[PDB]
Description:
Chains A, B: Pfam families: Dyp_perox_C (PF20628), Dyp_perox_N (PF04261). Chains A, B: One of its GO terms (cellular component) is cytosol. Chains A, B: Residues 57-135 form the Dyp-type peroxidase N-terminal domain. Chains A, B: This is Dyp-type heme-dependent peroxidase. The structure is a homodimer. Chain A is α+β, with helices and mostly antiparallel strands. Chain A has one domain (1-307). Chain A is 26% helix and 26% strand. Chain A is built from 9 helices and 13 strands. Chain A has helices spanning 29-49, 66-69, 107-121, 156-161, 185-188, 193-200, 220-224, 261-271, 299-303; strands at residues 16-24, 56-62, 84-86, 89-91, 98-104, 125-134, 174-183, 226-227, 233-234, 237-238, 241-245, 248-257, 286-296. In chain A, the strands form 3 sheets. In chain A, strands 1, 2, 5, 6, 7, 10, 11, 12 and 13 form a 9-stranded antiparallel beta sheet that branches. In chain A, strand 3 and strand 4 (89-91) form a beta hairpin. The two termini of chain A are 27 Å apart.
Amino acid sequence: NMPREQLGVCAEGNLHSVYLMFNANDNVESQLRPCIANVAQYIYELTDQYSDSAFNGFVAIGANYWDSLYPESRPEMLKPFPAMQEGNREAPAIEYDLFVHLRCDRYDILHLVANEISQMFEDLVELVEEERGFRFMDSRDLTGFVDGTENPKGRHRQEVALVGSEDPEFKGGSYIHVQKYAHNLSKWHRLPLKKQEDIIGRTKQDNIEYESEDKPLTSHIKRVNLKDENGKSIEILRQSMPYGSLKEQGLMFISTCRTPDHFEKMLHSMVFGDGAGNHDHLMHFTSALTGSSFFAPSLDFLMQFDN
Amino acid sequence: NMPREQLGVCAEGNLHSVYLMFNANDNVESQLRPCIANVAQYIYELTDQYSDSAFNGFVAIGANYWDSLYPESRPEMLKPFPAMQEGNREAPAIEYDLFVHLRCDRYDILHLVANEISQMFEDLVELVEEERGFRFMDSRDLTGFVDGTENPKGRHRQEVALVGSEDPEFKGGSYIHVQKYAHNLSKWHRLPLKKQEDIIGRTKQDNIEYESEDKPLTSHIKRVNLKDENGKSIEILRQSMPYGSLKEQGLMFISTCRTPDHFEKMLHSMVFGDGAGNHDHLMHFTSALTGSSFFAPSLDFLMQFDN
C-alpha cells in the first residue's frame, strides 16, 4: 500500500513518555494544518535521529476539532469520547483539539523534543495539559501488576491498531482513546495480596492468568477481554503508561485501534458491567479524570497540506 | 570522628531526582522528630538496597522550623534564606519546614521511594511543592551549557560541604540553600552563540573556561567564582539539576556547604554585582521563583529521638 502509519502508534514499549494536549486558538486552521504536517514529519524523522534511545511518537487530532481542521473529509467512525457513568464509576469526556504523544528511553531527549514542538506551534495553540509517564519496574502499573500482557505482538499490532482499506483515504491511521486514571494507591495497597489478585484476575508477581473457571466476573481481566458475535477476540493495542507524582498518579490509559468501538465495548463492560450486575471492581481503586477521542492520521494524510 | 553525614549531600551526579517540600501541621513535633529519624535512616539504607541505580538522598530541616523541632540547640550559623532584590533581579525567600532530596539513576525507583516516604509522614505534614529533576545530556543545564564544572571533587567534597569540628554537635551536617530558577528559554536560545558564551564565561560545546583577561565582569563565571580576604577560593558543592516541563522549566539550584554565607556572598555578587555596577547578566534570562534555607543534619543527630 501507499500511506505510512505514524510510528509510535504501534511502537514497542519505552522507559519514558510525554503527553501533550493542545487546544487551538480561533481561526488558526489555515496555518495549523501545514504546521502539523511539519510536526508529524519531525516526529517521524526523529525516530531515526534518536534510534539510540528508541524515540517514537505521533500527533493525533481531537474528534471535536477534526471537522474544523479537515472539513473536506473524516475517518468513517470518528466520534467523541463515549462518556459513561453509574455510581462512583465515571468515565467523563474532556476533549482536546490536539494530542502529541512522545516516547523515548531517554527523558532528556523527550524534554528537548517537547520544547521544540511547542516552539513549533508558535502562537497557534495553547498547551492545556502536560503529563509525563514512565515505565515502573518491569512494565508494571503503580498497582504493582504487570500491564499490557494481553497486548498483540508482531505484525498483528498493525492489524489491530491501524485502519486498513475499509476506509482507504485514512488507511494507516488509528482511533485513539485516552483516559487519565488516578489511582487511589493507599486504598489499593491496603488490600491483602489475594484480594488484589482476585480483583485483577492474575497473580501479582508471576502475572499468571487465572483459570477461566476461577476468574471472578468482577475481575478486570474478565471484564476487559471480550469477544464479538463469533467468539473472536475484540482487541485493542494499549500504549498506556504510569504517570504522575504524589499530588496525583496512576495510569495514562491509551487505546489505539482500527475502530473506536472496541474501546467503547470494553469501557462499557467495566462501568455498566456484564448485564447481570458484575462490573469492574478495579474501578473501586482508581478514577478516570479525563477521557478523549482522537484520530492519529497516517503521515501522508497530514502532509498533503501546505496552506 | 563519630557522626555520619547523610549520603547524597555529597553524592556524585545522577540521572533523576525528586524534590519534596513539606510543611508541618500544628503541634506535631513530638511525633515528627522520630518519624524523621525513620525517614533519614530509610534513605540511608536505600543507598545499599538500590546501589544498582546509585540511589542516594537526604532530609533537611527548614531554618524557620528548626527551633520548633529541635528547640534544645541549633547549628551555629543557621539563618533564613537571604532574600535580595534590585531591578528585575529578585531572589525571594519562600521557606519550607522540611526538605526531602532523592536521587537515583532510575525514575521508577524514586517514584516508589517518594510514595513510601509520603506514606511514612502519615498526617503529620503536607506536601507543598514537588518537582522532579533530570540530567539533560552530558550534565548540561537547559541553557545548553555544562553545569557543575567548577564543583569540588574527591574527599574535597566533604571538606567543602560538611560541617566539621567547628560546631561539633552538628558535625556531619550541611547548610543547604535552594532556589528554583525558571529559565526563559525562548529568550535565551535567540541569543547568538557568542552572546550566550560571553554571558556565561565559557565556550558552549567544549565548555572551555575563558582566559580571565577575557571574562566579562557581567559573566556568570566571573560573578560566582569568588575568593576570601586571602585570595582563597570561596566554594560550595552544587547538587543542582534541570527540572520542570513546558509550563515552567529551569534549574533547581541546590547549594550544600559548611557555612551558609558562601552561598550568600555569591548570590549577592550576582544581584548587586561587583560594587562597580556589573551584575550577573545570566539573571536576564532566568527567574528565581523560590529560595529556601535548611540544615541537613548528620544521620546520628536525627536519630537521637524517639519521643
